[PDB]
Amino acid sequence: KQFTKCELSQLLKDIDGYGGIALPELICTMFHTSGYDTQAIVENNESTEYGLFQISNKLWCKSSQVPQSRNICDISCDKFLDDDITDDIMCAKKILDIKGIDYWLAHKALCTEKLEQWLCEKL
Ligand SMILES: [Ca+2]
Ligand SMILES: [Ca+2]
């Protein structure tokens, strides 16, 4: 499941304003982060990041790769690879609450201006 800009927008609509974050800027961040793909898996040394919001097994979810993980979202990382983003949103709201929008590098780099394009058209 790879969403289009409008699909995701409607799904995340209730969340505009959460953490002081504007929906378009979150839309832009996700675009450069996973391309709105619920199956994105990105790996490196000490870790792997999962799904839509690219949540890290290093601190946020539990995976056999990093057994010492604090597992802040009390959930295994496979739950971020399925079609239901409900739980991904709950963990992401946790990240926003604790760390802030800066968890995602793409926000400060490409999502603080030219936001008009990240707005949904009409279906
Ligand atoms: Ca999920
Ligand atoms: Ca999926």
Coordinates of N, CA, C and O and ligand atoms in Angstrom, one line a residue:
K1 N 0.8 -1.2 0.0 CA 0.0 0.0 0.0 C 0.9 1.2 0.0 O 1.7 1.4 0.9
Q2 N 0.8 2.0 -1.1 CA 1.5 3.2 -1.4 C 0.3 4.1 -1.6 O -0.6 3.8 -2.4
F3 N 0.2 5.2 -0.8 CA -1.0 6.1 -0.9 C -0.6 7.2 -1.8 O 0.5 7.4 -2.2
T4 N -1.7 7.9 -2.3 CA -1.5 9.1 -3.1 C -1.5 10.3 -2.1 O -2.0 10.1 -1.0
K5 N -1.1 11.4 -2.5 CA -1.1 12.6 -1.6 C -2.5 12.9 -1.0 O -2.6 13.3 0.2
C6 N -3.6 12.8 -1.8 CA -5.0 13.0 -1.3 C -5.5 11.9 -0.4 O -6.1 12.2 0.6
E7 N -5.2 10.6 -0.7 CA -5.6 9.5 0.2 C -5.1 9.8 1.6 O -5.8 9.8 2.6
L8 N -3.8 9.9 1.7 CA -3.1 10.1 3.0 C -3.6 11.4 3.7 O -3.8 11.4 4.9
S9 N -3.8 12.4 2.9 CA -4.3 13.6 3.5 C -5.6 13.5 4.2 O -5.8 13.9 5.4
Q10 N -6.6 12.7 3.6 CA -7.8 12.5 4.2 C -7.7 11.7 5.5 O -8.4 11.9 6.4
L11 N -6.8 10.7 5.4 CA -6.5 9.8 6.5 C -5.9 10.5 7.7 O -6.1 10.1 8.9
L12 N -5.1 11.6 7.4 CA -4.4 12.3 8.5 C -5.0 13.6 8.8 O -4.5 14.4 9.7
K13 N -6.2 13.9 8.2 CA -6.9 15.2 8.4 C -7.1 15.6 9.9 O -6.8 16.8 10.2
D14 N -7.6 14.7 10.7 CA -7.9 15.0 12.2 C -6.7 15.4 12.9 O -6.7 16.0 14.0
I15 N -5.5 15.1 12.4 CA -4.2 15.4 13.0 C -3.5 16.7 12.7 O -2.4 17.0 13.2
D16 N -4.1 17.6 11.9 CA -3.6 18.9 11.6 C -3.6 19.6 12.9 O -4.6 19.6 13.6
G17 N -2.6 20.3 13.3 CA -2.5 21.0 14.6 C -1.8 20.3 15.7 O -1.4 20.9 16.7
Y18 N -1.7 19.0 15.6 CA -1.2 18.2 16.7 C 0.3 18.4 16.7 O 1.1 18.3 15.8
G19 N 0.8 18.9 17.9 CA 2.2 19.2 18.2 C 2.6 20.6 17.5 O 3.7 21.0 17.6
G20 N 1.5 21.3 17.0 CA 1.7 22.6 16.4 C 2.1 22.3 14.9 O 2.5 23.2 14.2
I21 N 2.0 21.1 14.5 CA 2.4 20.7 13.2 C 1.2 20.8 12.2 O 0.1 20.4 12.5
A22 N 1.5 21.5 11.0 CA 0.5 21.7 10.0 C 0.5 20.5 9.1 O 1.6 19.9 8.7
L23 N -0.7 20.0 8.8 CA -0.8 18.8 7.9 C 0.1 18.8 6.6 O 0.7 17.8 6.3
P24 N 0.1 19.9 5.8 CA 0.9 19.8 4.6 C 2.4 19.6 4.9 O 3.1 18.9 4.0
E25 N 2.9 20.1 6.0 CA 4.3 19.9 6.3 C 4.6 18.5 6.7 O 5.7 18.0 6.5
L26 N 3.6 17.8 7.3 CA 3.8 16.5 7.6 C 3.7 15.7 6.3 O 4.3 14.6 6.2
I27 N 2.8 16.1 5.4 CA 2.6 15.4 4.1 C 3.9 15.4 3.3 O 4.4 14.3 2.8
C28 N 4.5 16.5 3.3 CA 5.8 16.8 2.6 C 6.9 15.9 3.2 O 7.7 15.2 2.5
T29 N 6.9 15.8 4.6 CA 7.9 15.0 5.3 C 7.8 13.6 4.9 O 8.8 12.9 4.7
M30 N 6.6 13.0 4.9 CA 6.3 11.6 4.6 C 6.7 11.3 3.2 O 7.2 10.3 2.9
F31 N 6.4 12.3 2.3 CA 6.8 12.1 0.9 C 8.3 11.7 0.7 O 8.7 10.8 0.0
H32 N 9.2 12.6 1.3 CA 10.6 12.4 1.2 C 11.2 11.3 2.1 O 12.3 10.8 1.9
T33 N 10.3 10.8 3.0 CA 10.6 9.8 4.0 C 10.4 8.3 3.6 O 11.3 7.5 3.7
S34 N 9.2 8.1 3.0 CA 8.9 6.7 2.6 C 8.2 6.7 1.3 O 7.9 5.6 0.7
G35 N 7.9 7.9 0.7 CA 7.1 8.0 -0.5 C 5.7 7.5 -0.3 O 5.1 7.0 -1.3
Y36 N 5.1 7.6 0.9 CA 3.8 7.1 1.4 C 3.6 5.6 1.2 O 2.5 5.2 1.0
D37 N 4.7 4.9 1.4 CA 4.7 3.4 1.2 C 4.7 2.7 2.5 O 5.6 2.8 3.3
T38 N 3.6 2.0 2.9 CA 3.5 1.3 4.2 C 4.5 0.2 4.4 O 4.7 -0.3 5.5
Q39 N 5.2 -0.2 3.3 CA 6.2 -1.3 3.3 C 7.6 -0.9 3.2 O 8.5 -1.7 3.0
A40 N 7.9 0.4 3.3 CA 9.3 0.9 3.2 C 10.1 0.4 4.4 O 9.7 0.4 5.5
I41 N 11.2 -0.3 4.1 CA 12.1 -0.8 5.1 C 13.5 -0.3 4.7 O 13.9 -0.5 3.6
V42 N 14.1 0.5 5.6 CA 15.5 1.0 5.3 C 16.5 0.6 6.3 O 16.4 1.0 7.5
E43 N 17.5 -0.1 5.9 CA 18.4 -0.6 6.9 C 19.9 -0.1 6.7 O 20.3 0.5 5.7
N44 N 20.6 0.0 7.9 CA 22.0 0.4 7.9 C 22.9 -0.5 8.8 O 23.1 -1.6 8.5
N45 N 23.5 0.2 9.8 CA 24.4 -0.5 10.7 C 23.6 -1.1 11.9 O 23.2 -2.3 11.8
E46 N 23.4 -0.3 12.9 CA 22.8 -0.6 14.1 C 21.3 -0.7 14.0 O 20.6 -1.2 15.0
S47 N 20.7 -0.5 12.8 CA 19.3 -0.4 12.8 C 18.5 -0.5 11.5 O 19.1 -0.2 10.4
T48 N 17.2 -0.6 11.6 CA 16.3 -0.6 10.5 C 15.1 0.3 10.8 O 14.8 0.5 12.0
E49 N 14.6 0.9 9.8 CA 13.4 1.9 10.0 C 12.3 1.3 9.3 O 12.5 1.0 8.1
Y50 N 11.1 1.4 9.8 CA 9.9 0.7 9.3 C 8.7 1.5 8.8 O 8.3 2.4 9.5
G51 N 8.2 1.1 7.7 CA 6.9 1.7 7.2 C 6.9 3.2 6.8 O 7.9 3.8 6.6
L52 N 5.6 3.6 6.8 CA 5.2 5.0 6.4 C 6.0 6.2 7.0 O 6.5 7.0 6.3
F53 N 6.0 6.1 8.3 CA 6.7 7.1 9.2 C 8.2 6.8 9.4 O 8.9 7.5 10.2
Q54 N 8.7 5.7 8.9 CA 10.1 5.3 9.1 C 10.5 5.3 10.5 O 11.5 5.9 10.9
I55 N 9.9 4.5 11.3 CA 10.1 4.4 12.7 C 11.2 3.4 13.0 O 11.2 2.3 12.6
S56 N 12.1 3.9 13.8 CA 13.4 3.1 14.2 C 13.3 2.0 15.2 O 12.8 2.3 16.3
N57 N 13.8 0.8 14.9 CA 13.9 -0.2 15.9 C 14.9 0.1 17.0 O 15.0 -0.6 18.0
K58 N 15.7 1.1 16.8 CA 16.8 1.6 17.7 C 16.2 2.1 19.0 O 16.8 2.0 20.1
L59 N 15.0 2.7 18.9 CA 14.4 3.2 20.1 C 12.8 3.1 20.3 O 12.3 2.9 21.4
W60 N 12.1 3.1 19.1 CA 10.7 3.1 19.1 C 9.9 1.8 19.0 O 8.7 1.8 19.4
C61 N 10.4 0.8 18.4 CA 9.7 -0.4 18.3 C 10.7 -1.6 18.5 O 11.9 -1.4 18.6
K62 N 10.1 -2.7 18.7 CA 10.9 -3.9 19.0 C 11.0 -4.8 17.9 O 10.0 -5.3 17.3
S63 N 12.3 -5.2 17.6 CA 12.7 -6.1 16.6 C 13.9 -6.9 17.1 O 14.7 -6.5 17.9
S64 N 14.0 -8.1 16.6 CA 15.1 -9.0 17.0 C 16.5 -8.5 16.6 O 17.5 -9.0 17.1
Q65 N 16.5 -7.5 15.7 CA 17.8 -6.9 15.4 C 18.5 -6.1 16.5 O 19.7 -6.1 16.6
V66 N 17.6 -5.4 17.3 CA 18.1 -4.6 18.3 C 17.4 -5.0 19.6 O 16.4 -4.4 20.0
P67 N 17.9 -6.0 20.3 CA 17.2 -6.5 21.5 C 17.2 -5.5 22.7 O 16.4 -5.7 23.6
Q68 N 18.2 -4.6 22.7 CA 18.3 -3.7 23.8 C 17.4 -2.5 23.6 O 17.4 -1.6 24.5
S69 N 16.6 -2.4 22.5 CA 15.7 -1.3 22.3 C 14.8 -0.9 23.4 O 14.2 -1.8 24.0
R70 N 14.7 0.4 23.7 CA 13.8 0.8 24.7 C 12.3 0.6 24.4 O 11.4 0.5 25.2
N71 N 12.0 0.3 23.1 CA 10.7 0.0 22.6 C 9.6 1.0 23.2 O 8.6 0.5 23.7
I72 N 9.8 2.3 22.9 CA 8.9 3.3 23.4 C 7.4 3.2 23.0 O 6.5 3.3 23.9
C73 N 7.2 2.7 21.8 CA 5.8 2.6 21.4 C 5.1 1.3 21.7 O 3.9 1.0 21.3
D74 N 5.8 0.5 22.5 CA 5.3 -0.8 23.0 C 4.6 -1.6 21.9 O 3.5 -2.0 22.1
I75 N 5.4 -1.9 20.9 CA 4.8 -2.6 19.7 C 6.0 -3.2 18.9 O 7.1 -2.7 18.9
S76 N 5.8 -4.3 18.2 CA 6.8 -4.9 17.4 C 6.8 -4.1 16.1 O 5.7 -3.7 15.6
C77 N 8.0 -4.0 15.5 CA 8.1 -3.3 14.3 C 7.4 -3.8 13.1 O 7.1 -3.1 12.1
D78 N 7.0 -5.1 13.1 CA 6.3 -5.7 11.9 C 4.9 -5.0 11.7 O 4.3 -5.0 10.7
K79 N 4.3 -4.5 12.8 CA 3.0 -3.8 12.8 C 3.1 -2.5 12.0 O 2.0 -1.9 11.8
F80 N 4.2 -2.1 11.6 CA 4.4 -0.9 10.8 C 4.5 -1.2 9.4 O 4.7 -0.2 8.6
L81 N 4.4 -2.5 9.0 CA 4.6 -2.9 7.6 C 3.3 -3.4 6.9 O 3.2 -3.5 5.7
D82 N 2.2 -3.5 7.7 CA 0.9 -3.9 7.3 C 0.1 -2.7 6.7 O 0.5 -1.6 6.6
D83 N -1.1 -3.0 6.2 CA -1.9 -1.9 5.6 C -2.6 -0.9 6.5 O -3.0 0.2 6.1
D84 N -2.8 -1.3 7.8 CA -3.4 -0.4 8.8 C -2.5 0.6 9.4 O -1.6 0.2 10.2
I85 N -2.5 1.9 9.1 CA -1.6 2.9 9.6 C -2.1 3.5 11.0 O -1.5 4.4 11.5
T86 N -3.2 2.9 11.5 CA -3.7 3.4 12.8 C -2.6 3.4 13.9 O -2.4 4.4 14.6
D87 N -2.1 2.2 14.1 CA -1.0 2.1 15.1 C 0.3 2.9 14.8 O 0.9 3.4 15.7
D88 N 0.6 3.0 13.5 CA 1.8 3.8 13.1 C 1.5 5.3 13.5 O 2.4 6.0 14.0
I89 N 0.3 5.8 13.3 CA -0.1 7.1 13.7 C 0.0 7.3 15.3 O 0.5 8.3 15.8
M90 N -0.4 6.3 16.0 CA -0.3 6.4 17.5 C 1.2 6.5 17.9 O 1.5 7.3 18.7
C91 N 2.1 5.7 17.2 CA 3.5 5.8 17.6 C 4.1 7.1 17.2 O 4.9 7.7 17.8
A92 N 3.7 7.6 16.0 CA 4.2 8.8 15.4 C 3.8 10.0 16.3 O 4.5 11.0 16.5
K93 N 2.5 10.0 16.9 CA 2.1 11.0 17.8 C 2.9 11.0 19.1 O 3.1 12.0 19.8
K94 N 3.4 9.8 19.4 CA 4.3 9.6 20.6 C 5.7 10.2 20.3 O 6.3 10.9 21.2
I95 N 6.2 10.0 19.1 CA 7.4 10.6 18.7 C 7.3 12.2 18.8 O 8.3 12.8 19.3
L96 N 6.3 12.7 18.2 CA 5.9 14.2 18.2 C 5.9 14.7 19.6 O 6.3 15.8 19.9
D97 N 5.3 14.0 20.6 CA 5.2 14.3 22.0 C 6.5 14.4 22.7 O 6.7 15.2 23.6
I98 N 7.3 13.4 22.4 CA 8.6 13.3 23.2 C 9.8 14.0 22.6 O 10.5 14.8 23.3
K99 N 10.1 13.8 21.3 CA 11.2 14.2 20.5 C 10.9 15.5 19.7 O 11.6 16.4 19.7
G100 N 9.7 15.4 19.0 CA 9.3 16.6 18.2 C 9.4 16.2 16.7 O 9.9 15.1 16.4
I101 N 9.1 17.1 15.8 CA 9.1 16.9 14.4 C 10.5 16.6 13.8 O 10.6 16.0 12.8
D102 N 11.5 17.1 14.5 CA 12.9 16.9 14.1 C 13.4 15.4 14.1 O 14.6 15.1 13.9
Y103 N 12.5 14.4 14.4 CA 12.9 13.0 14.3 C 13.1 12.7 12.8 O 13.9 11.9 12.4
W104 N 12.4 13.5 12.0 CA 12.4 13.3 10.5 C 13.3 14.4 9.9 O 12.9 15.6 9.9
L105 N 14.4 14.1 9.3 CA 15.4 15.0 8.7 C 14.7 15.8 7.6 O 15.0 17.0 7.4
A106 N 13.8 15.2 6.8 CA 13.2 15.9 5.6 C 12.4 17.1 6.0 O 12.2 18.0 5.2
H107 N 11.9 17.2 7.2 CA 11.1 18.3 7.6 C 11.8 19.7 7.5 O 11.3 20.6 6.8
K108 N 12.9 19.8 8.2 CA 13.7 21.0 8.2 C 14.4 21.4 6.9 O 14.6 22.5 6.6
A109 N 14.7 20.3 6.2 CA 15.4 20.5 4.9 C 14.6 20.9 3.7 O 15.0 21.7 3.0
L110 N 13.3 20.4 3.6 CA 12.5 20.6 2.4 C 11.1 21.0 2.7 O 10.3 21.3 1.7
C111 N 10.7 20.9 3.9 CA 9.3 21.2 4.3 C 9.0 22.4 5.2 O 8.1 22.4 6.0
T112 N 9.8 23.5 5.1 CA 9.5 24.7 5.8 C 9.1 25.9 4.9 O 9.0 27.1 5.3
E113 N 8.9 25.6 3.6 CA 8.5 26.6 2.6 C 8.0 25.8 1.4 O 8.1 24.6 1.3
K114 N 7.3 26.5 0.5 CA 6.8 25.9 -0.7 C 5.7 24.8 -0.4 O 5.5 23.9 -1.2
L115 N 5.0 25.1 0.7 CA 4.0 24.1 1.2 C 2.7 24.0 0.4 O 2.0 23.1 0.6
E116 N 2.4 25.0 -0.5 CA 1.2 25.0 -1.3 C 0.9 23.7 -2.1 O -0.2 23.2 -2.1
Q117 N 2.0 23.2 -2.7 CA 1.9 22.0 -3.4 C 1.5 20.8 -2.6 O 1.1 19.8 -3.2
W118 N 1.7 20.8 -1.3 CA 1.4 19.6 -0.5 C 0.0 19.5 0.0 O -0.4 18.8 0.9
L119 N -0.8 20.4 -0.6 CA -2.2 20.5 -0.3 C -3.1 19.6 -1.2 O -2.8 19.5 -2.4
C120 N -4.1 19.0 -0.7 CA -4.9 18.1 -1.6 C -5.9 18.8 -2.5 O -6.7 19.6 -2.0
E121 N -5.8 18.4 -3.7 CA -6.7 18.9 -4.8 C -8.2 18.6 -4.5 O -8.8 19.3 -3.7
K122 N -8.8 17.7 -5.3 CA -10.2 17.3 -5.2 C -10.5 16.0 -5.9 O -9.9 15.7 -7.0
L123 N -11.2 15.2 -5.1 CA -11.6 13.8 -5.6 C -13.2 13.9 -5.5 O -13.8 14.5 -6.4
Ligands
CA1 CA 0.2 -0.7 11.0
CA2 CA 1.5 -3.0 3.6

